Amino acid sequence: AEIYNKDGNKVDLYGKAVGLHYFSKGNGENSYGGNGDMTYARLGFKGETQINSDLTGYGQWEYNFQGNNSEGADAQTGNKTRLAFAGLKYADVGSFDYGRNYGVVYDALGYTDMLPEFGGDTAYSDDFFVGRVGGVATYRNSNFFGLVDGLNFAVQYLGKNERDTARRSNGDGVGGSISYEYEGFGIVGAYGAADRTNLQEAQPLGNGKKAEQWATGLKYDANNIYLAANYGETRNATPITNKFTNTSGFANKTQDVLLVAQYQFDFGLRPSIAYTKSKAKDVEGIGDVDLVNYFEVGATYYFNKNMSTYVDYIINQIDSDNKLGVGSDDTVAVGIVYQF
Template sequence: MMKRSLLALLIPALLATGGVQAAEIYNKDGNKVDLNGKINVGHLFSDDTGNDGDVSYARFGFKGETQIAQDLTGYAQWQYNFQLNKTEGADALSGDKTRLGFAGLKFGKWGSFDYGRNYGLVYDALAWTDMLPKFGGDSGYADGFLSTRSTGVATWRNSNFFGLVDGLNVALQYQGKNDRTGTDAVRRSNGDGYATSVSYNADSGLSVVGTYANLGRTQAQNNAARGEGDRAESWATAIKYDANQIYLATVYGNTHNATPISGGFANKAVNFEAVAQYQFLNGFRPSLAYVSSRGKDIENIGDADIVKYVSFGANYYFNKNFLAYAEYKVNLLSDNNPLGLANDDVTGVGLNYQF
């Protein structure tokens, strides 16, 4: 039977390129630097032109640590994304972007504090189902009220609750106002706000987490055709089992004025995701998932599906650094969905090298 520590080495989350895959390039006198990266070459097949074609990309980054005192450590992380499906000389809209960039201090049992571009705490729950071979992660979006990667966030995390309760983790986060302009003025702006996360990880492989975020909305967002209220609010709960080569996870949550749709935001969205995977010892990892997000009380529409699909897929790990993947997304949106969203099935295939 495969031990959980070996599984953690073999199956890194595809959205991250750090952790166990990092290549150590310097470690001396309390200073350590690890490089990490990935090249993902892939292709989508669909009758929807927006989900058809080459989707290859590369990511590169580093993690650094320096020992300042016995219980005080400085650390930093940076990661950049390069789109490989664009022409040479493509402009800034090519998709190249800084995904992460933050620095902070660890204070022993008192936890860590960092600032910069980092994951919002709502993702502490959403990450557990964001494990699909190609698709997934539909309940959050970048620069979206602390649901995934966000700019200008101050984060405090504490593991094992000050050393008193093994497996109990707490976190608090603050984000300042980002009043963007142009095409990002509505979708990617935010006012001042905060988020919190509480999780418990048992030795049996069973874990639970709850997250909550509440942020102000900007004037541009309040002036949009859809979405009312001065605050954007979201909460999510998740449970997972990760042991004995089995991975099961489900997430349920609500958002208010925080899920983007055409013309602004849904006044309310109900999100549900579930995934089941099994790791065979030969490297084969099949995956089955259901993902849905349903908007409520949308102006001039009422209730409508925003995301709804079933996914069948698999990863095949040649070793801990190289894998092949394939996934078929059965789109369950009806032909007459009132938001006019793409409702064609999509197939994704590709290869992934990471270190």
């Protein structure tokens, strides 16, 4: 909501409350998304200030508050800042921001990250360029300097983040993306590469000094229809766990595909169908193994721009024999959302 607009500065305070539950058999330990209460809230602000006719400054901060914790010792489980960045945008020259922000490969992966609750499986947080990540400098360009309608490109530098776990760490790297959109159609490519830290190199799973991620997308978003596909591959980038040996690391190689189809009826119903598969290769001790493999059926009803509910069912196709011990059971999410 726009809670302040004066002197060329406008501020957006936003947020939501999501009542959310997952249903899966038994513990949910052997399932796609687990089991139980998953309620949470969000709070964020995004600001935009007019410095002059050609120059705008902006910033944004976004936080996640889990609402499925006690008020006791686990009160903080899963809380975090999601975004925190400030930047400048000039004319048709381009924009630059720094902070915690989306890695550039998400420019492609965004095409399919459209499911009510699940999906966007390969867009991992703190995983180089595929998702939200800290210390990223990003240059963006709209309509090629104002010369080409619908053509955008982006260049991003990722600072080194040496953390106490290999999962959330990374070395220095560079990536970029390019996209063209014309009258309903969208196409996008993105690539990123970066050094791995010594801690990542010390993990049992994943072998190499460099990490690489890329992905391409096609979409059609005209009127009430939404169709999109993504394809991508990664080297030493995708985080994995062997539940049998309690071993952790990254996948030497992955190949992923994501498809989504949805339709928005004017009366508020938005049915959804999707497919996602992420395969890993050359995993030490395992070889080839599916990481994600499922169909999705679901729907969201929008009462309005502020209220909605949704069901999201995961027809999980990972088999009970999966060599990594990836969960084989289905998961369904039901939720009710208030946002401003």
